Amino acid sequence: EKEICKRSVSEISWHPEGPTKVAVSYAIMRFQQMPEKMPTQAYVWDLLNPNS
Amino acid sequence: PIIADELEKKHIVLLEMYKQDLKQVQSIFLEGKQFVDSMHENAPLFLNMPPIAGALTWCKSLRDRIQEPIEKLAQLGQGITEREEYKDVQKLYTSITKSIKDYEDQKILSWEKEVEDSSQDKLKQTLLCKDENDLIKVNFDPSLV
């Protein structure tokens, strides 16, 4: 939500116990196309509250 | 000769299949060529490459795909080369290879000019320190990386 440019979902991983959470990374694999001081941060979603 | 009579019909079907792939690559190349030069998001260029070398590797990957069946077609006997259908595929192929080679020649020529301009930057790059606060940093040009 409201990031400087768009950030490509570079990789995903599932929670080992079961399908409750999904950790996802965010980075540009296009070369030098990444903006200067873009938001560098991975998130982790829950299947109950997929809003944020 | 009994298998050879079947092979004659089989040979015509192979030539038709290679036309469809060759035509399909041509259609992918034309769409791609636009995006490569543009340097758009969702381009033929795959993951982290240069915007110039990436084109050449892309073009090479297509050129390699088309070139594998021809080296196989030459091995077939029963005068496949004398058949008018084969001749129409070879004539199409040649026009595609030339158009790809022309695109590579435009990229290398444009690159060589950029190589001469970049070698100057390096020498006169020195150190740059910006803002009211003295915060000196590496000035190394992105175009040099």
Chain B interface mutation, best of A31, A32, A34, A37, highest count of B Cβ atoms under 10 Å: A31
Are the Cβ atoms of B49 and A32 closer than 8 angstroms? no
Chain A interface mutation, best of B35, B36, B47, highest count of A Cβ atoms under 10 Å: B47
> Over the Cα atoms of chain B, what is R_g?
24
Expressed in Å, this structure's resolution amounts to 8.0
Bridge pairing between strands B135-137 and A12-14: unpaired
- Paired tokens of A39: 């938001």
DSSP, res A31: T
d(CA B34, CA B38) in angstroms, rounded, equals: 6
d(CA B45, CA B43) in angstroms, rounded, equals: 5
d(CA B32, CA A29) in angstroms, rounded, equals: 18
Of A32, A41, A2, residue with least CA distance to B49: A32
Q: How many helices (H) and strands (E) does chain B have?
A: 3, 2
